[PDB]
Design an enzyme around this catalytic site. Structure first.
Site, mmCIF file in Angstrom:
data_model
loop_
_atom_site.group_PDB
_atom_site.id
_atom_site.type_symbol
_atom_site.label_atom_id
_atom_site.label_comp_id
_atom_site.label_asym_id
_atom_site.label_seq_id
_atom_site.Cartn_x
_atom_site.Cartn_y
_atom_site.Cartn_z
ATOM 1 N N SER A 206 32.457 3.109 64.311
ATOM 2 C CA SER A 206 31.333 3.622 65.681
ATOM 3 C C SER A 206 31.517 5.146 66.331
ATOM 4 O O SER A 206 32.964 5.936 65.863
ATOM 5 C CB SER A 206 32.100 2.633 66.052
ATOM 6 O OG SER A 206 33.144 2.428 66.925
ATOM 7 N N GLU B 198 21.024 16.153 47.928
ATOM 8 C CA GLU B 198 19.159 16.095 48.252
ATOM 9 C C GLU B 198 19.048 15.644 49.478
ATOM 10 O O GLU B 198 18.106 15.768 50.044
ATOM 11 C CB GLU B 198 19.187 15.291 47.107
ATOM 12 C CG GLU B 198 16.971 15.179 47.088
ATOM 13 C CD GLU B 198 16.511 14.649 45.773
ATOM 14 O OE1 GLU B 198 17.315 14.196 45.090
ATOM 15 O OE2 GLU B 198 15.588 14.711 45.793
ATOM 16 N N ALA C 44 34.096 -1.448 63.707
ATOM 17 C CA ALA C 44 32.479 -1.784 63.186
ATOM 18 C C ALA C 44 32.698 -1.096 62.072
ATOM 19 O O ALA C 44 31.428 -1.636 61.039
ATOM 20 C CB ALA C 44 31.593 -0.482 64.117
ATOM 21 N N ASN D 49 24.576 -6.480 61.779
ATOM 22 C CA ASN D 49 25.459 -5.649 60.479
ATOM 23 C C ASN D 49 24.243 -5.982 59.576
ATOM 24 O O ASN D 49 24.093 -5.329 58.515
ATOM 25 C CB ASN D 49 26.918 -6.550 60.372
ATOM 26 C CG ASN D 49 27.709 -6.131 61.189
ATOM 27 O OD1 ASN D 49 27.167 -4.777 62.375
ATOM 28 N ND2 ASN D 49 29.505 -6.200 61.439
ATOM 29 N N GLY E 185 35.015 3.819 69.355
ATOM 30 C CA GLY E 185 35.805 2.867 69.858
ATOM 31 C C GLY E 185 37.015 4.385 69.385
ATOM 32 O O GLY E 185 36.448 4.996 68.952
ATOM 33 N N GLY E 186 38.104 3.547 69.291
ATOM 34 C CA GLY E 186 39.706 4.769 69.468
ATOM 35 C C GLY E 186 39.507 5.184 68.008
ATOM 36 O O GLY E 186 39.591 6.261 67.746
ATOM 37 N N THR F 20 32.805 -2.953 74.078
ATOM 38 C CA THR F 20 33.813 -2.641 74.573
ATOM 39 C C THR F 20 34.541 -1.962 74.777
ATOM 40 O O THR F 20 35.568 -1.802 75.570
ATOM 41 C CB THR F 20 34.135 -2.495 73.015
ATOM 42 O OG1 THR F 20 34.125 -1.454 72.344
ATOM 43 C CG2 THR F 20 33.100 -3.932 72.327
HETATM 44 C C1 LIG Z 1 37.944 -7.185 72.702
HETATM 45 C C2 LIG Z 1 38.562 -7.415 74.991
HETATM 46 N N1 LIG Z 1 36.767 -8.317 75.093
HETATM 47 C C3 LIG Z 1 36.186 -7.566 76.690
HETATM 48 O O1 LIG Z 1 34.859 -8.015 76.184
HETATM 49 N N2 LIG Z 1 37.050 -7.834 77.538
HETATM 50 C C4 LIG Z 1 36.380 -7.725 78.882
HETATM 51 C C5 LIG Z 1 36.821 -9.049 79.614
HETATM 52 C C6 LIG Z 1 38.557 -8.454 79.840
HETATM 53 C C7 LIG Z 1 38.963 -9.193 80.975
HETATM 54 C C8 LIG Z 1 40.413 -9.878 80.588
HETATM 55 C C9 LIG Z 1 41.259 -8.768 79.941
HETATM 56 C C10 LIG Z 1 40.397 -8.577 78.381
HETATM 57 O O2 LIG Z 1 41.794 -7.936 77.370
HETATM 58 C C11 LIG Z 1 42.229 -9.120 77.052
HETATM 59 C C12 LIG Z 1 38.739 -8.395 79.067
HETATM 60 C C13 LIG Z 1 38.637 -7.579 77.363
HETATM 61 C C14 LIG Z 1 39.349 -5.698 78.086
HETATM 62 O O3 LIG Z 1 39.059 -5.457 76.909
HETATM 63 C C15 LIG Z 1 37.655 -4.051 77.746
HETATM 64 C C16 LIG Z 1 37.708 -4.493 78.736
HETATM 65 C C17 LIG Z 1 38.520 -4.936 79.112
HETATM 66 C C18 LIG Z 1 38.080 -5.389 80.509
HETATM 67 C C19 LIG Z 1 37.728 -5.488 81.829
HETATM 68 C C20 LIG Z 1 36.893 -4.301 81.043
HETATM 69 O O4 LIG Z 1 35.738 -3.171 81.767
HETATM 70 C C21 LIG Z 1 35.749 -3.333 83.408
HETATM 71 C C22 LIG Z 1 36.289 -3.661 79.681
HETATM 72 O O5 LIG Z 1 35.275 -2.613 78.900
HETATM 73 C C23 LIG Z 1 35.197 -2.939 78.343
HETATM 74 O O6 LIG Z 1 42.026 -9.428 79.628
HETATM 75 C C24 LIG Z 1 42.068 -10.015 81.601
HETATM 76 O O7 LIG Z 1 40.674 -10.696 81.895
HETATM 77 N N1 LIG Z 2 26.527 -2.790 64.963
HETATM 78 C C1 LIG Z 2 28.123 -3.203 64.582
HETATM 79 N N2 LIG Z 2 28.920 -2.760 66.006
HETATM 80 C C2 LIG Z 2 30.132 -2.649 66.721
HETATM 81 C C3 LIG Z 2 30.838 -3.850 65.567
HETATM 82 N N3 LIG Z 2 31.953 -3.564 65.808
HETATM 83 C C4 LIG Z 2 32.313 -2.984 67.489
HETATM 84 N N4 LIG Z 2 30.784 -2.271 67.201
HETATM 85 C C5 LIG Z 2 30.493 -1.426 68.336
HETATM 86 O O1 LIG Z 2 32.010 -0.364 68.129
HETATM 87 C C6 LIG Z 2 32.257 0.249 69.331
HETATM 88 C C7 LIG Z 2 33.262 0.132 69.219
HETATM 89 O O2 LIG Z 2 34.271 0.853 68.710
HETATM 90 P P1 LIG Z 2 34.945 -0.240 67.701
HETATM 91 O O3 LIG Z 2 34.720 -0.109 66.299
HETATM 92 O O4 LIG Z 2 35.226 -2.033 67.826
HETATM 93 O O5 LIG Z 2 36.661 -0.140 67.458
HETATM 94 P P2 LIG Z 2 37.577 0.060 66.626
HETATM 95 O O6 LIG Z 2 37.108 1.574 66.067
HETATM 96 O O7 LIG Z 2 37.940 -0.360 66.256
HETATM 97 O O8 LIG Z 2 38.749 1.351 67.240
HETATM 98 P P3 LIG Z 2 40.011 1.116 68.458
HETATM 99 O O9 LIG Z 2 39.814 1.431 69.847
HETATM 100 O O10 LIG Z 2 41.557 0.811 68.154
HETATM 101 O O11 LIG Z 2 39.537 -0.556 68.071
HETATM 102 C C8 LIG Z 2 31.014 -0.891 70.924
HETATM 103 O O12 LIG Z 2 30.081 0.330 70.898
HETATM 104 C C9 LIG Z 2 30.923 -1.657 70.207
HETATM 105 O O13 LIG Z 2 29.685 -2.737 70.196
HETATM 106 C C10 LIG Z 2 30.219 -4.190 64.637
HETATM 107 O O14 LIG Z 2 30.406 -5.238 63.820
HETATM 108 N N5 LIG Z 2 28.933 -3.915 64.400
#
Ligand SMILES: CCNC(=O)N1CCc2cc3c(c(OC)c2[C@@H]1[C@H]1OCc2c1ccc(OC)c2OC)OCO3
Ligand SMILES: Nc1nc2c(ncn2[C@@H]2O[C@H](COP(=O)(O)OP(=O)(O)OP(=O)(O)O)[C@@H](O)[C@H]2O)c(=O)[nH]1
Ligand SMILES: Nc1ncnc2c1ncn2[C@@H]1O[C@H](COP(=O)(O)OP(=O)(O)CP(=O)(O)O)[C@@H](O)[C@H]1O
Ligand SMILES: Nc1nc2c(ncn2[C@@H]2O[C@H](COP(=O)(O)OP(=O)(O)O)[C@@H](O)[C@H]2O)c(=O)[nH]1
Ligand SMILES: [Ca+2]
Ligand SMILES: [Ca+2]
Ligand SMILES: [Ca+2]
Ligand SMILES: [Mg+2]
Ligand SMILES: [Mg+2]
Ligand SMILES: [Mg+2]
Lengths: 423, 348, 55, 438
Positions: D140, D254, D12, D228, D143-144, D179
């Protein structure tokens, strides 16, 4: 590159694994000679997740084929895509495992496991960034069940920070080879409970019922069962094989408690050969959540969903996908635990599988899966209370205590599911 | 299918609304902590408005207007009338009131106006109220009033007592007019066709304010301290039909002309005043609310507002009709199911 | 409703309007301690896993 | 002139950074190759735009920016993007294995291996600053990497640059584009650890950006690119005072002085108007009064909440385009007579106003229509605590069952940090209520 190392062990493991590589080789445009002949660069985007690139721009699956007898693997090497596999990755003995977990785990399998780990280490060393491992096997036999779980244990020791993923076929009396399958399955489930992060539970009776009741197949064969499995494996790996998504983030979002990592997969559509009719997004969504489309033969209404992953494939309205996914969980919110907010996540992929314009794959972490382990536990106890067929195992050095412990571990797993189905 | 939750088990009005909703077959009740609801029947205290309207794919509606407490608290109501230009401090339908803090405070202003009345021979009887309820003092001396407030320990208000109330005959007795008003998500103001008069059974005695059975008309005080309870009307509840007939036979006028025009004017004024502060027109969730207005009528047929209740009850004979009306105009208007309207729409 | 501190330039201007008047960060060592402490608990968990696998 | 260094953490942060620096270049007339014809001082200068851009002897204007992500896929898009020429390799820092949506993995396991490298790359940019104000940190909550590694960097930045100010642009999690299921955990973990180290932080709820894109831009299913570009417009109007001549919010200090009287309550609410679709052929240009009135509509806020039921501690109006002070005060007057604008007693009821005559720049081919005037309101209102309440409730639901906690403990985090972070958020929630409610 987030490479995945694939392992298929035993007769069932190698037959479903062979079909899996045949299916996804077609989706990515790889032919039986390893040469790419696709029309979309989306096919090569994350092709390195499952394939190595050899000389001449050939693509070789990162797959290791394991068995304790040569029969099933010879047929793989002579199968449709038998030539795309690296010959060095065929590791097999000659004695077989006699549908005996002890032979696979302690005697026959022990003698061969180091050879397999040598190939795993060779495939892992040439990985830019190894995600983890993917194992296909059955739990009712000897090699996939007993040596498969021995392999998982040795792999975890050497790669403790990597993800371990299995597709595990659960035995059923309706599609049974030997009476000892509940013994082998009960011993394996405990190994899986401790040493995997994600296990897709594939129940052979569910596959049978689907081939018979839904697909209108009067006499289903293992081949017919494996068609459902390969279609399901393609679905659950779509998010790993196309832009979107790795094994650890999947586990992190799907597994709220470490032991409860046994998923119910589902697929839609599954139509009898009517195969030309278009499917709307609402229809996909209703069928994907329908019990008749589940591969674990568990009634989801008998438990609750801890987490759910959904994957829609094909050109469709993402707006309409979100709407229908929200509709399902908004109309049946009682079957989703309230203490995990927004526990349903949906992904979309424009590339549909072969033969379908649209498809939906379902991955559920439901507490109803306890019905599967309860079935196995009952079948186990019915024989174990009379010590029936135990001599096959004590003859390989096992003692009765190890069966008593496997029984208790199974009943604890069932209880752990029950505490969250009411909590 | 529509889904709703119940978070106030003590609500008699919305217990019936819940029964009607389920009785339609197109609404499903969920657990009080399930967030995937279309409709919330929220709790009276600390309703989590901040968590509404954040559920994708769900139109969410709640049966309370956030911020309407300003109107439904005796202290803040006075503050609202004194400080709002729409409802000037000189509005003719609200008695002279002051906010008195026992321990921003108008204790000195109350004494000043008291001395103006004490100087002349004009009636100088005041009443003290608070939020406790279930704590009322009617005295002719300011010292006794202010002393009782410091002993209670809560924010109070000193309000002029209506020494010349309208008295129903036979009986020579005080009364109260409750009006039920429903405000929907579009901020339409609906006045329930049926009101209720809570009458005292004891004859109004101007000499003794100690015996509060004739001065206070609350149903609780009548059903426990009144020897003539239920003598003139059932449960000391007179409805509009009888009261209207009485005003004709006795005072040669109708309820609509002598009282109901002032009531509607008052309801419209109070609700229009706070509309900018509580409206959910462009908000991510929607609100409606049922209000209870309490009015007093003097002997000149002049209506005075005394209190507004935000979680009111209903009259037994009117529960069915009113609750059905709530579902029709407040719930089904946002969530349609598959004309002799009981409400009077106060246009604005 | 008074306008104060009006500043003008070629790019724009700024001002203020008043409607009514009024009525120790951890050190580098302490951070290294937390990071190293978490790593020790992480090595202890893995050693236990490897010991369990050794049994 | 004093330099500001921008740091973009996680997907993000990185993708929002790419949109902002794209917009900055269009605003300052900097081509993708880093050249700036309007800059007649070559190889140097202390102009306002040099707060964000340094200069090479060849005339290239290089952003004072660092991108950091624990996986390379997102930053590799910058290396090959339109503005690849803008940055040099040293500015783009990518790991191998991301934090798998796990705060503990980003903060402890993986962050420990790369923190020294990031700080050293930041020191390089700091060493070319004659006088560094501080840092702008994009990330964000959910995200981790964005949560876990950011909090670690913020701690170290305080150690190495104690006097320097730090501002945040934080993406608050929304399930419609979420995500990870554990984002409430990561949000609360990182807010607790970053709270003392951030002077001022602008939260952006993806839910609000999502709906604004659907409502005002007629986008059925908005993407990150849509989100974005809108976010970068708002970031741009917040940072314009640092990049152009002016007298309001001229330095990071400021921002704190004008928007944050109490240090812990340092989350100003941003409201932007107007957002007009570029596909609309006919569009009636809105006036100063109309766009100012829209700054009090929840539908235009970066975080959905009701300021009518809170109290203001400060309010800044940042206009871009054809705006003169006379129209502003005329619009403010009428708005005060129709809006519930309640200030805390210990604060003056008023508005600090800034006008930049150059109307907002729109990315060619984007979704936002060109407008003659726009405004961003930065109001520090207690109503934004509604976002903490929502977040803390989701946290309480999962943590009461210890769901997913084993993933964090497994990375070296102790369960006690969960409760400590939640207790800090509990105190934060009560501070807002003590300030905004009677
Ligand atoms: C960038 C990945 N985006 C993403 O939308 N998804 C959602 C669907 C999905 C399905 C898959 C799979 C996945 O991962 C490779 C994912 C990933 C994964 O990562 C977030 C995540 C995922 C799964 C379940 C989750 O919640 C219950 C979840 O939480 C948000 O492999 C096997 O079938
Ligand atoms: N507004 C906006 N939100 C984003 C974007 N990319 C990811 N997000 C949000 O950020 C959250 C996930 O965090 P990320 O920034 O994707 O994760 P990360 O910082 O890369 O950390 P990792 O877990 O190591 O992948 C989710 O709530 C997303 O909706 C972006 O480009 N724009
Ligand atoms: N200013 C005034 N002048 C004359 N009589 C008054 C008065 N204020 C109150 N009363 C009498 O005292 C009674 C109690 O007043 P009030 O309505 O404040 O109490 P309450 O909160 O118990 C009514 P409810 O049960 O509807 O909420 C009224 O019914 C009325 O008869
Ligand atoms: N779905 C499926 N199940 C199989 C297949 N072959 C065997 N099984 C099941 O696997 C179990 C027997 O294990 P098997 O793989 O044959 O033994 P192994 O070679 O020692 O691993 C029984 O439950 C069979 O029903 C197959 O091709 N497909
Ligand atoms: Ca041998
Ligand atoms: Ca220059
Ligand atoms: Ca500091
Ligand atoms: Mg066999
Ligand atoms: Mg009352
Ligand atoms: Mg990432």
């Amino acid at each position: 590159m987030r490479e995945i190392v694939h392992i298929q062990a035993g007769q069932c493991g190698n037959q479903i694994g062979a079909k899996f590589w045949e299916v996804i080789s077609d989706e990515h445009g790889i032919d039986p000679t390893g040469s790419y002949h696709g029309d979309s660069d989306l096919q090569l985007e994350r092709i390195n997740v499952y394939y190595n690139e050899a000389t001449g721009n050939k693509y070789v699956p990162r797959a290791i084929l394991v068995d304790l007898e040569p029969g099933t693997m010879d047929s793989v090497r002579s199968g449709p895509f038998g030539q795309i596999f690296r010959p060095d990755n065929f590791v097999f003995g000659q004695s077989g495992a006699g549908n005996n977990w002890a032979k696979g785990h302690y005697t026959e399998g022990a003698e061969l496991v180091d050879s397999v780990l040598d190939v795993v280490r060779k495939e892992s060393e040439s990985c830019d960034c190894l995600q983890g491992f993917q194992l296909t096997h059955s739990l009712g036999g000897g090699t996939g069940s007993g040596m498969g779980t021995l392999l998982i244990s040795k792999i975890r020791e050497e790669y403790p920070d990597r993800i371990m993923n299995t597709f595990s076929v659960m035995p059923s009396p309706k599609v049974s080879d030997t009476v000892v399958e509940p013994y082998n399955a009960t011993l394996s489930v405990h190994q899986l409970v401790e040493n995997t992060d994600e296990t897709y539970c594939i129940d052979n009776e569910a596959l049978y019922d689907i081939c018979f009741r839904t697909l209108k197949l009067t006499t289903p064969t293992y081949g017919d069962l494996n068609h459902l499995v390969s279609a399901t494996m393609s679905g659950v790996t779509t998010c790993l094989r196309f832009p979107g998504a790795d094994l650890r983030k999947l586990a992190v979002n799907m597994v709220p408690f470490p032991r409860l990592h046994f998923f119910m997969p589902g697929f839609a559509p599954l139509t009898s050969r009517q195969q030309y009719r278009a499917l709307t997004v609402p229809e996909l969504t209703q069928q994907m959540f329908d019990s008749k489309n589940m591969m674990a033969a568990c009634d989801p209404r008998h438990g609750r969903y801890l987490t759910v992953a959904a994957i829609f494939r094909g050109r469709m309205s993402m707006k309409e996908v979100d709407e229908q996914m929200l509709n399902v969980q908004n109309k049946n919110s009682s079957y989703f635990v309230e203490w995990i907010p927004n526990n349903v996540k949906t992904a979309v992929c424009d590339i549909p599988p072969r033969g379908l314009k649209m498809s939906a794959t379902f991955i559920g972490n439901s507490t109803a899966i306890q019905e599967l382990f309860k079935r196995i536990s009952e079948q186990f106890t019915a024989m174990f209370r009379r010590k029936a067929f135990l001599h096959w195992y004590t003859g390989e050095g096992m003692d009765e205590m190890e069966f008593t412990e496997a029984e208790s571990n199974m009943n604890d797993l069932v209880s752990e599911y029950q505490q969250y189905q009411d909590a | 299918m529509y889904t709703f939750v119940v978070r106030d088990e003590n609500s008699s009005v919305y217990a019936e609304v819940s029964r009607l909703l389920l009785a339609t077959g197109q609404w499903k009740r969920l657990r009080k902590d399930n967030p995937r609801f279309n409709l919330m029947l929220g709790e009276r205290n600390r309703l989590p408005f901040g968590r509404l309207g954040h559920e994708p794919g769900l139109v969410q509606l709640v049966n309370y207007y956030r911020g309407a407490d300003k109107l439904c608290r005796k202290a803040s109501l006075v503050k609202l009338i004194k400080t709002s230009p729409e409802l000037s401090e000189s509005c003719t339908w609200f008695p002279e009131s002051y906010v008195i803090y026992p321990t921003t405070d108008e204790r000195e202003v109350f004494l000043a106006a008291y001395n103006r009345r004490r100087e002349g021979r004009e009636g100088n009887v005041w009443i003290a109220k608070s939020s406790a309820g279930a704590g009322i003092l009617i005295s002719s001396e300011a010292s006794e009033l202010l002393d009782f407030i410091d002993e209670q320990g809560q924010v109070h208000v000193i309000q002029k007592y209506l020494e010349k109330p309208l008295l129903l005959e036979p009986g020579h007795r005080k009364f109260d007019i409750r009006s039920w008003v429903l405000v929907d998500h579009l901020y339409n103001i609906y006045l329930y066709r049926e009101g209720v008069l809570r009458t005292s059974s004891e004859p109004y005695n101007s000499a003794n304010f100690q015996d509060k059975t004739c001065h206070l008309t609350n149903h609780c005080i009548q059903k426990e301290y009144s020897k003539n309870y239920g003598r003139y009307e059932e449960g000391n509840e007179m409805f509009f039909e009888e009261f209207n007939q009485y005003l004709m036979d006795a005072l040669n006028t109708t309820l609509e002309n002598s009282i109901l025009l002032q009531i509607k004017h008052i309801i419209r004024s109070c609700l229009m005043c706070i509309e900018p502060a509580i409206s959910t027109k462009h908000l991510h969730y929607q609100s409606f609310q049922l209000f209870g207005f309490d009015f007093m009528v003097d002997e000149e047929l002049k209506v005075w507002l005394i209190e507004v209740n935000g979680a009111p009850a209903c009259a037994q004979k009117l529960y069915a009709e009113l609750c059905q009306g709530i579902v029709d105009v407040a719930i089904s208007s946002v969530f349609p199911l598959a004309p002799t309207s009981i409400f009077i729409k106060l246009h604005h | 409703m008074e306008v104060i501190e009006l500043n003008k330039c070629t790019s724009g201007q700024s001002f203020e309007v008043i409607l009514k008047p009024p009525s120790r960060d951890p050190s580098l060592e302490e951070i290294q301690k937390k990071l190293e402490a978490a790593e020790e608990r992480r090595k202890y968990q893995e050693a236990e896993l490897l010991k369990h696998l050794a049994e | 002139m004093r330099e500001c260094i921008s740091i973009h953490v996680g997907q993000a942060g990185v993708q929002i950074g790419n949109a902002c620096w794209e917009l900055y270049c269009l605003e300052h007339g900097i081509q993708p190759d880093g050249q700036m014809p309007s800059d007649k001082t070559i190889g140097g200068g202390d102009d306002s735009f040099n707060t964000f851009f340094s200069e090479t002897g060849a005339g290239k204007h290089v952003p004072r920016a660092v991108f950091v992500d624990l996986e390379p896929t997102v930053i590799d898009e910058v290396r090959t993007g339109t503005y690849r020429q803008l940055f040099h390799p040293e500015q783009l820092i990518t790991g191998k294995e991301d934090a798998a949506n796990n705060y503990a993995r980003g903060h402890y396991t993986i962050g420990k291996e790369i923190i020294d490298l990031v700080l050293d790359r930041i020191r390089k940019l700091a060493d070319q600053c004659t006088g560094l104000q501080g840092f702008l940190v994009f990330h964000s909550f959910g995200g981790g990497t964005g949560s876990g590694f950011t909090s670690l960097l913020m701690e170290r930045l305080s150690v190495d640059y104690g006097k320097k100010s730090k501002l945040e642009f934080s993406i608050y999690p929304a399930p419609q584009v979420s995500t990870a299921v554990v984002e409430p955990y990561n949000s609360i973990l990182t807010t607790h650890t970053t709270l003392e180290h951030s002077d001022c932080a602008f939260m952006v709820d993806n839910e609000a950006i999502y709906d604004i894109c659907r409502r005002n831009l007629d986008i059925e299913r908005p993407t990150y690119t849509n989100l974005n570009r809108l976010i970068s417009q708002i970031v741009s109007s917040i940072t314009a005072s640092l990049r152009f001549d002016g007298a309001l919010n001229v330095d990071l200090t400021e921002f704190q002085t004008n928007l944050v009287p109490y240090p812990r309550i340092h989350f100003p609410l941003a409201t932007y108007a107007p957002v007009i679709s570029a596909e609309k052929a006919y569009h009636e240009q809105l006036s100063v009064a109309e766009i100012t009135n829209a700054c009090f509509e929840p539908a235009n806020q970066m975080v959905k909440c009701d300021p009518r039921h809170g109290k203001y501690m400060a309010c800044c109006l940042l206009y871009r385009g054809d705006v003169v002070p006379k129209d502003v005060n005329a619009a403010i007057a009428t708005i005060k007579t129709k809006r519930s604008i309640q200030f805390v007693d210990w604060c003056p009821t008023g508005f600090k106003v800034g006008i930049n005559y150059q109307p907002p720049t729109v990315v060619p081919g984007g979704d936002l229509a060109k407008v003659q005037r726009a405004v961003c309101m930065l109001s520090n209102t207690t109503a934004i605590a509604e976002a903490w309440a929502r977040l803390d409730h989701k946290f309480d639901l999962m943590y009461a069952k210890r769901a997913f906690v084993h993933w964090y403990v497994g990375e070296g985090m102790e369960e006690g940090e969960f409760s400590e972070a939640r207790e800090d958020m509990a105190a934060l929630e009560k501070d807002y209520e003590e300030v905004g409610v009677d």
